[PDB]
């Protein structure tokens, strides 16, 4: 016969290998595929759709976890206090982890492109404000304060007919990617950190509401791509199904 | 006139599913061009209504001063046939000499995907799927030891003759497909077509497969669609005389030439049951973890 | 007549390379495949689209 | 022109409106009428056009300050309704898309903001016992809730382990009460199959659920209705007989 | 030799893989095929050819076996009774498991297309009669009397010098295949109820008889294909041959 | 009474659609029906039994005697055709010896 | 003379691409056939065939 | 019989003989014999840098 | 099948051997590589500072 | 619920203060006389 030598690896089963092997139909042809709505080609196209951002972390007490999908908003009676504050990390726990980006990033370990957070306004028409969104990229602390917030990238919210800022966070890393930024030695790859601060005031006339809440969207934007597949961060299943 | 207008004019019957949006190349993740300063009036993309239901179109290059980037990171990776081309466990047979379990050295498995969370919740993602498959079977002891045993997997399809034994008629394979492999070989490998009779495989039904009442006790067949459902799996030992040594054998499934349609959200609570969404209801945890205050990280 | 056609994804957009050694074709590899996107699909269905500079509720 | 202004004229039906978002077309694809390479069943069937395709008002949900959201499953809403349901009874296989235009309207004084979304196979899961050793299923009454609708029992999980966090990618549109008053969703025919039995299969689940709860002072009108409307859009039926129901 | 590695699959016996093996004769010849009339090229040639539909099921006392393959028809008293009913479903039991279509079926687990069934009247030729045919596709229950049964699709046949009509049941079908309908949860693929009424009366003159009989054959149309190999559903042998 | 099938088309018997029909007849073919390998035939040679003591069996070849190959055989008359023989060797408990 | 031809289908209508090794050419794969059917064959072996249309017996 | 299984950055990583991280439905895994051969695996360049 | 014989020397692991194995990662990408001062193509390079 | 089933307008109330709602020609005949009020109810144009 025709002389053959074994290299190392015969008898291996590499459950990513893609070869091929014996088929058990004989001329078996697929039912014919119709027309479906909706086709995906690329996960990079769910990635894009935007979906809640989680920012409100309260577990208390399962029966409100309604109330982690918004923010608090009020007349705050001062100046430029701070409203909220996140991590731009979307593999990191915890915001990120309600949004669809999130988990289809937890099946990737490396990420790459500038992200959008969109911000919608949930207030009465009859309630206006303007609000700072900062974005400060790695290195540096919790911005103490809104005056040394802005100094990094920011955008400025007025309350309007057009309830949503978006806040685009862009791909500024040293790496052309970012492996998962969790939590110590790996901080390397962190994004940055997102606060919210109130520009002016939240403004109400007589009879409505002196409270509200906003809603915070997050997607990823278009030179947005992943890198290398990992196995989902967290499994579900406690012990054995069925 | 002749004949009437309104049959004339009439869309009724139009085929073609009008397309709003058509598909674009994307090998490379997108360039960035340059950016400017720009203080006007009415061009405003920032501001958006989320009410639409539309995602955010404002571009970086309108929110901050860009520079140019030539982008050639590749989207490949982030395929369905690169997503779902890895082989992973969805089941476990047991031949144990002596148990509660299958005891004679024949085990049947209803061919059931689920049961294994991590290639289900990547599976879960998509609600109609179509794929070809390769399957892997992997035999040793519990201990992993390897035996000289003589195994047979046969594949029986809907309707097919379910073995009842160790040593029944239907091993005889006369047209159903089966493996002969000793565990001496190494794992059994097959290739395998898309076989539902619907275009697609569904991930979920959302409706019973029978009519008539539904009454308290046809209730567990409800999100039962039998177009998913490929028959039973079927291992011998083979016989006649029983087995020496304790067996375990484990599926792997790795699919190719995949086409998924609708997406889904993605489950954030333990699997259960098999074909089955039901959840803890006392013990309902967030999907991520959580933190202390808003104003601290 | 080549070789049988009876991959799932025949008859498909997706322009494929693969390699296969038996008759029928869905015991391929999943081989190369075409890098086609369309986000619009899923983030913007809507029926008038507005441009980017655009104010969309107006 | 305008975006927020729009009207819906299908059949002898009409419906008007001046605080809208723009029209979502499900997943940027208008539903057709089955073409002859999908078809399989020989039968010629009958496309009953007007008669079907027009709006239909089935429900009214009052909004309450403390509400977790409600849900319908289609097309299991007009199976007892109008001469569409008709025809899905006597017959065996049905085809169409939908015109959803859910409505709720309030003042200026008012906030809050639903979350309309057409989630396809909506398959709804038990709470297991409340510790997780029971197989329950859900009642006909549940997943087939029909007219009035079901309302959640928890709504963070989607009543089927799924998370409402991100249930934003099937078409979905908000109805924000300091900006649009009503959303609509026109979505095609989704299923793997060109027919289905309209009785036992159901295509796909409407959710409205606000996520930002309705709030008010003590003003003079505390009692806000969300409304449902549906018109389907290029019906098929084939596979004549009698006349079946649930 | 030349580099090769062993993918998982080697040693193998698929019993359905179509790969090559050593010929044990060389320059063996078979002998020359002669004609031999009436060749078969595809099992779809046999399933057009009508057979036998046992819709009387009456092992008593397996010797009026041969009753079993016609019907009772008499000169009914009344209007429109009942006069026979069955399941239209091919691979389910158990009418059309006396049919060569319900055997070849069996050997297969998905099939598509329209059916045929033939019913021949042995009656005397001065026996006449019209009789109502209806086929309900699934979905409804059995109908209950005859004018909630013609609701579905039906064809009135007379009593002439064609002794049979053919009662073509259409492929309607939600899937493009049907999976064998047996017998719980696979109700999914059933193709539904054939039922026969009479139209009018069994008329006879004073001389001929009061009771005739008639005869079902049944068949695949010309659309028909069949897609999976399944084992037969029942195995000829208890317990050992010879 | 003539001999002869229904040649009814469901075309005259129902008003019909058009079906463009490109479901296959591949999988019918007497090739793909019987390149199905099957049990044929079962060789004993125990150590001490009524059976065969010697380790020599003769079997005289026949394809009945195992009546799911032969049933799916028996449909027809004559057939012609190639085989491909497949020889499983083990102990009565399927386990593998070195002989 | 090329290969052995000792197929059992030679010099049949039936047209077979197949995948061989050996110089005998009945050791080879059932490989892929060509689809023809004769139904009538079996179905209506009548000698003189009348229409759809008409009626069989005058 | 092994499992020799590779783990990316942030991917589960077993705590037990029988951990639910041995599924591998997407982190590449090999099942070798010691019968067989040494297996050997061809591995790209996947630094971020 | 096709007919081989095995020569002497399967299953060996020849550790300066230049052949090819199964790769882990299909469709995998290494991150494009920028331009980075004093490559090093050759040994005697070196051997000459 | 049971009023929806014919000619119908979905009205909001907006910037523009009327809606009108056609009631189309809907007749057996090609003329309808004075609807008023018993045997001639054949020439009723319906209820809004
Ligand atoms: C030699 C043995 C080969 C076995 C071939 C089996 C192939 C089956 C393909 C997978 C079909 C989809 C799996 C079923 C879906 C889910 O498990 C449940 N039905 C969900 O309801
Ligand atoms: C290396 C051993 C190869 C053995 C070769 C045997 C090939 C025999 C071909 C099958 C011949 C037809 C089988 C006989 C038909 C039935 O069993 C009975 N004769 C029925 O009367």
């Not at chain 4, 689940?205 to 018109?231: E, H, K, N, R």
């Amino acid at each position: 016969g025709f002389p053959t030598e074994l290299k190392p690896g015969t008898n291996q089963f590499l459950t990513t290998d893609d070869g091929v092997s014996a088929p058990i139909l004989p001329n078996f042809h697929p039912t014919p595929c119709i027309h479906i709505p909706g086709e995906v080609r690329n996960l990079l196209e769910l990635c894009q759709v935007e979906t809640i951002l989680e920012v409100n972390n309260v577990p208390t007490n399962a029966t409100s976890l309604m109330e982690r999908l918004r923010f608090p908003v009020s007349a705050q009676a001062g100046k430029g206090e701070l409203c909220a504050v996140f991590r731009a990390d979307p593999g990191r726990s915890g915001p990120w982890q309600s949004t669809l980006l999130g988990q289809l990033c937890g099946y990737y370990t490396q990420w790459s492109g500038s992200l959008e957070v969109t911000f919608m306004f949930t207030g009465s028409f009859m309630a206006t404000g303007k609000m700072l969104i900062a974005y400060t990229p790695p290195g540096g602390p919790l911005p103490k304060d809104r005056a040394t917030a802005m100094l990094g990238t920011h955008v400025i919210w007025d309350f309007g007919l057009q309830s949503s800022v978006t806040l685009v966070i862009p791909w500024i890393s040293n790496t052309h990617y970012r492996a998962h930024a969790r939590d110590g030695v790996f901080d390397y790859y962190t994004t940055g950190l997102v606060s919210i601060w109130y520009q002016t005031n939240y403004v109400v006339p007589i009879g409505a509401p002196n409270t509200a809440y906003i809603i915070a969207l997050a997607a990823a934007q278009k030179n947005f791509t992943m890198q290398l597949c990992k196995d989902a961060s967290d499994i579900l299943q406690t012990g054995t199904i069925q | 006139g002749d004949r009437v207008a309104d049959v004339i004019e009439s869309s009724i019957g139009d085929s073609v599913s009008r397309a709003l949006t058509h598909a674009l190349p994307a090998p490379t993740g997108q360039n960035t061009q340059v950016s400017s300063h720009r203080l006007d009036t009415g061009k405003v993309p920032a501001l958006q209504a989320a009410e639409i239901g539309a995602s955010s179109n404002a571009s970086d290059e309108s929110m901050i001063e860009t520079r140019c980037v030539l982008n050639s990171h590749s989207t490949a990776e982030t395929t369905l046939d690169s997503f779902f081309s890895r082989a992973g466990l969805v089941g476990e047979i047991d031949l144990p000499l002596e148990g509660t379990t299958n005891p004679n050295g024949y085990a049947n498995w209803d061919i059931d995907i689920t049961g294994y969370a991590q290639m289900r919740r990547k599976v879960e993602l998509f609600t109609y799927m179509r794929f070809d498959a390769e399957f892997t079977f992997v035999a040793c002891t519990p201990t992993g030891e390897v035996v000289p045993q003589l195994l047979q997997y046969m594949f029986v399809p809907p309707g097919a003759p379910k073995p009842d034994s160790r040593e029944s008629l239907a091993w005889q394979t006369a047209t159903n497909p089966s493996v002969f492999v000793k565990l001496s070989d190494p794992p059994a490998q097959v290739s395998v077509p898309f076989m539902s009779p619907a275009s697609a495989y569904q991930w979920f039904y959302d409706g019973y497969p029978t009519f008539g009442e539904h009454k308290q006790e046809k209730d567990l067949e409800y999100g039962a669609c039998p177009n998913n459902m490929m028959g039973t799996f079927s291992v011998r030992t083979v016989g006649t005389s029983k087995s020496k040594y304790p067996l375990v054998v484990r599926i792997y499934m790795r699919m190719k030439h995949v086409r998924a349609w609708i997406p889904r959200p993605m489950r954030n609570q333990n699997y259960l049951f098999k074909a089955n969404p039901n959840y803890a209801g006392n013990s309902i945890k967030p999907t991520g973890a959580s933190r202390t205050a808003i104003t601290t990280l | 007549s080549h070789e049988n056609s009876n991959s799932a994804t025949e008859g498909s957009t997706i322009n494929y390379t693969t390699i296969n050694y038996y008759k029928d074709s869905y015991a391929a590899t999943a081989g190369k495949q075409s890098l086609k996107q369309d986000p619009d699909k899923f983030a913007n269905p809507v029926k008038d689209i507005f441009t980017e500079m655009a104010a969309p509720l107006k | 022109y305008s975006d927020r202004v729009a009207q819906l004229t299908i059949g002898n039906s009409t419906i008007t409106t001046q605080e809208a978002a723009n029209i979502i077309v499900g997943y940027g694809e208008w539903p057709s009428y089955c073409s002859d390479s999908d078809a399989t069943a020989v039968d010629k069937p009958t496309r009953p056009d007007v008669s079907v395709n027009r709006f239909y008002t089935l429900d009214t949900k009052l909004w309450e300050k403390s509400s977790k959201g409600w849900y319908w499953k289609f097309p299991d809403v007009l199976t007892e309704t109008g001469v569409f349901g008709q025809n899905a009874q006597f017959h065996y296989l049905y085809r169409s898309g939908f015109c959803i235009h859910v409505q709720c309207n309030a003042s200026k004084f008012h906030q809050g903001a639903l979350l309309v979304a057409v989630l396809p196979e909506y398959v709804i899961g038990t709470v297991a016992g409340g510790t997780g050793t029971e197989d329950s299923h859900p009642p006909y009454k549940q997943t087939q809730p029909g007219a009035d609708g079901f309302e959640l029992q928890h709504p963070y999980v989607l009543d089927a382990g799924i998370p409402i966090s991100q249930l934003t990618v099937c078409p979905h549109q908000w109805i924000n009460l300091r900006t649009n008053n009503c959303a609509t969703i026109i979505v095609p025919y989704i299923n793997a199959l060109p027919f289905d039995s309209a009785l036992n299969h159901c295509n796909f689940g409407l959710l409205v659920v606000p996520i930002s709860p309705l709030d008010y002072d003590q003003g003079a009108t505390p009692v806000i209705p969300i409304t449902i409307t549906l018109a389907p859009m290029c019906s098929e039926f084939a596979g004549l007989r009698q006349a079946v129901t649930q």
